[PDB]
């Protein structure tokens, strides 16, 4: 980690990066986040829910360096993308999270995992079906109906969505 690099190579100011670092340095003094810390860092997120399974998907959404563990620099790029990046970038990031096995394709199989994994994190207040939720996704994301959603399909599909676009732009201070 070096501070004035991060300032240059992300959308955060030195001021911001510090707050972020002090945030990080407290959630694990370790400096290195493995999946177990990752899991228990969400133990708080929600009262009596279980984000165990989601932690796993979040974890190997990183390891982009593939160095076994996630260093702070990964964590801030991730955030720089999610809070400040272009719609494209923020969207591509979500896509990579959904594409569990890293092959650029999202299938019913793995979308179910995600939704279940979040439902678990949340209230495992609820009436929306688990399966009946991937279905709404695919029937309104998979353009040609081949049951497989690609990055371009997911990109163009969300740009059309007059609120999933407001979800994305509105909000960012650290």
């Amino acid at each position: 980690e070096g501070l004035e690099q991060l300032e240059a190579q992300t959308n955060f100011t030195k001021r911001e990066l510090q707050v972020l670092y002090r945030g990080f340095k407290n959630e694990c003094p370790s400096g290195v986040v493995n999946e177990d810390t990752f899991k228990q860092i969400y133990a708080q997120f929600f009262p009596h829910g279980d984000a165990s399974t989601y932690a796993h998907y979040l974890f190997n959404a990183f390891d982009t360096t593939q160095t076994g563990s996630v260093k702070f620099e990964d964590f801030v790029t991730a955030l720089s993308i999610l809070l400040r990046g272009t719609v494209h970038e923020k969207l591509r990031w979500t896509f990579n999270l959904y594409d569990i096995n890293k092959d650029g394709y999202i299938n019913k199989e793995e979308m179910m995992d995600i939704v279940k994994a979040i439902y678990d994190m949340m209230g495992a207040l609820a009436e929306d079906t688990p399966r009946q939720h991937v279905d709404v996704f695919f029937q309104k994301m998979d353009k040609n109906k081949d049951g497989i959603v690609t990055l371009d399909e997911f990109l163009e599909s969300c740009q059309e969505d007059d609120n999933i676009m407001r979800s994305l732009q509105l909000f960012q201070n650290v």
Partner: protein
């Protein structure tokens, strides 16, 4: 406190289905019989409903000196502040029990929120 900054990684995974902005951070200055302690405001906010964590401390703020002043023992205060820092309240294996219970009672911290490391020694000499 800074867990809020992890919530957008969650919010990101929703996309596809599924004081508003008026508080900065300051270091606040806790004058204790002389020793000028310094901590991040948030650090105190971590346990509200305990003297410093709460509104109560407003009664100890000095308009002029522009700092909170406590005519208490500066030493024990270390632990009290350190409790806000790491989750753990430690028993200093040198100080007198009584000396430091007295102090815990003042700052609004309960006798045995003491971690497993020290509630051992807190037993064997109380």
């Amino acid at each position: 406190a800074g867990v809020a900054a992890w919530l957008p990684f969650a919010r990101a995974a929703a996309i596809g289905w599924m004081d508003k902005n008026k508080r900065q951070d300051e270091l606040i200055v806790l004058n204790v019989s002389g020793r000028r302690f310094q901590t991040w405001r948030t650090t105190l906010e971590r346990y509200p409903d305990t003297l410093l964590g709460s509104t109560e401390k407003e009664f100890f703020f000095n308009e002029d000196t522009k700092e909170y002043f406590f005519d208490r023992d500066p030493e024990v205060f270390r632990c009290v502040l350190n409790f806000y820092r790491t989750g753990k309240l430690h028993y200093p294996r040198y100080e007198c029990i009584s000396a430091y219970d007295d102090e815990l009672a003042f700052y609004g911290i309960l006798p045995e929120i003491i971690g497993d490391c020290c509630y051992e020694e807190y037993k064997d000499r109380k």
